[PDB]
Amino acid sequence: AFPSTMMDEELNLWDFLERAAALFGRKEVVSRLHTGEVHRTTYAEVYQRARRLMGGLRALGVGVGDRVATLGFNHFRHLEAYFAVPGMGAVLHTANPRLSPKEIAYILNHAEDKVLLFDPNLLPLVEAIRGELKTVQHFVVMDEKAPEGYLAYEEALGEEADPVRVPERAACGMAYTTGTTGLPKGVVYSHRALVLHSLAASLVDGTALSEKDVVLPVVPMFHVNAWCLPYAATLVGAKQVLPGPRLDPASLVELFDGEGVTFTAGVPTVWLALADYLESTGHRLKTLRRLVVGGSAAPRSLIARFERMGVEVRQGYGLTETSPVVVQNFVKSHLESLSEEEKLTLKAKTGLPIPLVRLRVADEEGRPVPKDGKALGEVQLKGPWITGGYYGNEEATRSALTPDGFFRTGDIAVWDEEGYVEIKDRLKDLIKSGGEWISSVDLENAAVVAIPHPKWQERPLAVVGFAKWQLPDAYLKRALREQYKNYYG
């Protein structure tokens, strides 16, 4: 009816790195490899090599819309791939190496990945599933050297190439979730989604990411793209410290103090081990001011634990299906007058819905439940970075949405007049141990329930093809939980 005079310019993830090279080219990207060695590079160097990776991947037959998979932890080569793949108009498929060999082979075949990039210490896993893969044409070891039948990352790098421009709604990356019944379900993100997501979650009431920040993603780069942290840190031009597979407290403290980390994010399990170590050694982190916890409900003790040491803890919530951030916790200005007990209770809640997200806690008919912090209902979402369905799964798609088009998280929650959400339960019958999923129904079909654990957050308990961490520790199910609520302490 009335067109605007605004330029039709597309949002693109490559713009984050292109800006980082131009304005903050000298800012560092520090990586700790699997061997323990520390690698140092910069945004300018990462930008140069990411351009070389684009030309290199093109030589291997990667075109627009093609899937390029990764199996690796947090380091600079993974960060180069985080930009090169979406930069050339291809799809970054970050796969989880902690899954079963059968799960990984299924998702690589389902996504029809053309090229696989993986860490040197994950070679045995790749050697094991290689015979099962039907689409991967080139196997690339993220290192200087590669064994026979394998291509080395540094050898794979080609001539510098310009980024390919695509409509912002086009695919940039994809990830499969194991937090469902049956087969893993695929979610395909767009440039538009991840750019908007990076902006809205970086605001002051969110992560408050700044150029002055030194960012350490403890969250794996195969968990919803490390919660988009590497993208958002590049956007602001913050220094990045990538810890690799070593997430033990001594290894982290070393990077925390040595590189002057100011902001970090990870799952509760890792933070509990860190807090335990800091308390036992009487050590205080000299620069860390802000800590984000997600993936699972952060215990009240974990927050108070870190506040005691001068570390601000902010909870965040989301799904593979939501990019992932939809909810972030912060204390409102008028609620600062609350007592320390009441404030801790508020901090222990899930948090407030973030900008550009439409959140509701609703019933079976889709009607919002009372905002009294007591009535239970399902968290339902709507927005530009929330999935509208699944890739190559009609049955999973048609049950993912409500009649009025809201995504169903499968999470039972309450909400109050202040707008705070608080995850209470789960509709989907699953177990989340140390940030990773275990299917109850898949265990039963071989009764199993999720039992609270101090360390992991849930542990399976079987009442009488799977890994050792999936094995139940000890030996109409809505009652079995309330009976053994304190079986694992």
Ligand X SMILES: [C][C][C][C][C][C][C][C][C][C][C][C][C]C(=O)O=P([O])([O])O[C][C]1O[C](N2[C]=NC3=C2N=[C]N=C3[N])[C]([O])[C]1[O]
Nearer to ligand X, 153 or 264 (CB): 264
Six-digit token string for 453 = 């654990």
Catalytic site residue from 168, 432, 436, 456: 432
The single-letter code of the amino acid at 79 is L
Nearer to ligand X, 56 or 268 (CB): 268
CB of 15 to its own copies, least distance (A): 7
Cα–Cα–Cα angle for 346, 436, 289, rounded to 5 degrees: 45
Q: Is residue 177 annotated as a catalytic residue, yes or no?
A: yes
- Specify the stretch interacting with ligand X by CB under 6 A; choose among 7-15, 61-69, 295-303, 305-313: 295-303
Q: Comparing C-alpha atoms, which of 144, 140, 145, 109 is closest to residue 126?
A: 140
- Binders of ligand X among residues 36 to 95 (CB under 6 A) are none
Tokens 């590079």 belong to 41
- Specify the stretch interacting with its own copies by CB under 8 A; choose among 288-296, 376-384, 431-439, 475-483: 376-384
**Per-residue binding letters, 208-247, with ligand X (x by CB under 6 A):** ----------------x--xxx--x---------------
Would you list the DSSP string of 202-216? Answer: SSTTTT---TT-EEE
- Binders of ligand X among residues 407 to 426 (CB under 6 A) are 409-411, 423, 426
In terms of C-beta density within 10 A (0-12 exposed, 13-18 middle, 19 or more buried), how is residue 481 classed?
middle
CB of 426 to ligand X, least distance (A): 5
- Binders of its own copies among residues 23 to 52 (CB under 8 A) are 23-24, 26
Handedness of CA 46, 47, 48, 49 (dihedral sign): positive
Q: Are 86 and 116 in contact (CB under 8 A)?
A: no
CB of 370 to ligand X, least distance (A): 21
- Residue 61 binds its own copies, judged by CB under 8 A: no
Discontinuities in the chain with C to N beyond 2.5 Å fall right after 446, 464, 475
- Specify the stretch interacting with its own copies by CB under 8 A; choose among 190-198, 215-223, 246-254, 480-488: 190-198
Six-digit token string for 346 = 């508020």
Tokens 């001594």 belong to 250
- Specify the stretch interacting with ligand X by CB under 6 A; choose among 138-146, 290-298, 301-309, 394-402: 290-298
- Residue 312 binds its own copies, judged by CB under 8 A: no
Cα distances from 357 to residues 13, 243, 380, 448, in angstroms, run: 20, 31, 10, 35
3-state class of 379 per DSSP?
strand
3-state class of 165 per DSSP?
coil
- Binders of its own copies among residues 430 to 469 (CB under 8 A) are none
Six-digit token string for 470 = 């999936």
Nearer to ligand X, 203 or 369 (CB): 203
Q: Are 293 and 306 in contact (CB under 8 A)?
A: no
Q: Are 452 and 444 in contact (CB under 8 A)?
A: no
Six-digit token string for 148 = 């026979």
Catalytic site residue from 177, 180, 387, 409: 177
Q: Helix 229-236 vs helix 14-23: angle between axes, to the nearest 10 degrees? A: 40
**Cα atoms in the Cβ-side hemisphere of radius 13 Å centred on 159:** 3
Would you list the DSSP string of 346-365? Answer: HHHS-BEEPTT-EEEEE-TT
Nearer to its own copies, 28 or 444 (CB): 28
- Residue 145 binds its own copies, judged by CB under 8 A: no
CB of 175 to Mg ion, least distance (A): 9
**Per-residue binding letters, 259-288, with ligand X (x by CB under 6 A):** ------x-----------------------
Q: Are strands 91-94 and 115-118 parallel, antiparallel or unpaired?
A: unpaired
Q: Is residue 437 annotated as a catalytic residue, yes or no?
A: yes
Nearer to its own copies, 387 or 439 (CB): 387
- Residue 346 binds ligand X, judged by CB under 6 A: no
- Residue 81 binds its own copies, judged by CB under 8 A: no
- Binders of its own copies among residues 276 to 295 (CB under 8 A) are none
- Residue 193 binds its own copies, judged by CB under 8 A: yes
CB of 298 to ligand X, least distance (A): 7
**Per-residue binding letters, 165-204, with ligand X (x by CB under 6 A):** ------------x-x------------------x--x---
Tokens 């969250």 belong to 219
- Residue 378 binds its own copies, judged by CB under 8 A: no
Q: Are 350 and 421 in contact (CB under 8 A)?
A: yes
Q: Are 302 and 268 in contact (CB under 8 A)?
A: yes
Q: Is residue 321 annotated as a catalytic residue, yes or no?
A: yes
Catalytic site residue from 18, 168, 259, 321: 321
Closest residue to Mg ion: CB criterion: 179
Cα distances from 322 to residues 79, 171, 249, in angstroms, run: 21, 15, 30
- Specify the stretch interacting with ligand X by CB under 6 A; choose among 16-24, 271-279, 281-289, 292-300: 292-300
DSSP bridge partners of 73? none
- Residue 361 binds its own copies, judged by CB under 8 A: no
Among 180, 407, 434, 451, binds its own copies (CB under 8 A): 407
Among 56, 89, 237, 316, binds ligand X (CB under 6 A): 316
Q: Which residues are catalytic?
A: 177, 321, 432, 437
Binding site for ligand X (CB under 6 A): 177, 179, 198, 201, 207, 224, 227-229, 232, 265, 292, 294-297, 315-320, 324-325, 328, 350, 409-411, 423, 426
